[PDB]
Design a protein around this ligand. Structure first.
Ligand code: HEM
Ligand SMILES: [C-]#N
Length: 139
């Protein structure tokens, strides 16, 4: 519980320094393996680096608040509008997780404890987004 939290915090600086590189790799993997999701995204925003930076910043936001995701509620609330408007479903979250974890393995080449810590954190972060979005879809 505590060791895993610290590993996620330790990764904040890594993401501050090369987060965009991680997310560039994430979108490469996802668009290659799951081309069906590509049209949901604006390619202009990929080419400019804006969306890679935005995702990296959202991951940073989650890592910073990993002990209490409620402290990113006002942030996630806003991202949820984009996701719901574009038809992001609960079932897309495992796709993102698989591609993100692979990107992490590729670029950070972490130890198993770090990989495990991100697998766990992602599940929690995804659940936070899913639950807010579910309300939007149903409310
Ligand atoms: C926990 C995982 C995720 C995080 C942290 C995340 C974060 C973000 C952020 C910060 C944005 C920028 C838009 C805004 O701020 O309103 C965004 C946009 C978007 N997200 Fe996600 N997202 C996640 C999962 C997903 C999933 C599962 C999908 C489904 C394919 C997805 C599809 C999109 C699309 C299509 C956009 C619009 C991008 C564009 O305008 O080009 N995201 N996401
Ligand atoms: C969302 N990327």
């Amino acid at each position: 519980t505590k060791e895993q939290i610290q590993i996620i915090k330790d990764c904040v600086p890594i993401l501050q320094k090369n987060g965009e590189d991680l997310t560039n790799e994430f979108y490469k993997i996802m668009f290659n393996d799951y081309p069906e999701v590509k049209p949901m995204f604006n390619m202009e925003k990929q080419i400019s680096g804006e969306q890679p930076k935005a995702l990296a910043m959202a991951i940073l936001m989650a890592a910073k608040n990993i002990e209490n995701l409620e402290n990113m509620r006002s942030f996630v609330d806003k991202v949820a509008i984009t996701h719901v408007n574009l038809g992001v479903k609960e079932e897309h979250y495992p796709i993102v997780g698989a591609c993100l974890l692979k990107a992490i393995k590729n670029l950070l080449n972490p130890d198993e404890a770090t990989l495990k810590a991100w697998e766990v954190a992602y599940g929690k972060i995804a659940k936070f987004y899913i639950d807010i979005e579910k309300k939007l879809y149903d409310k």
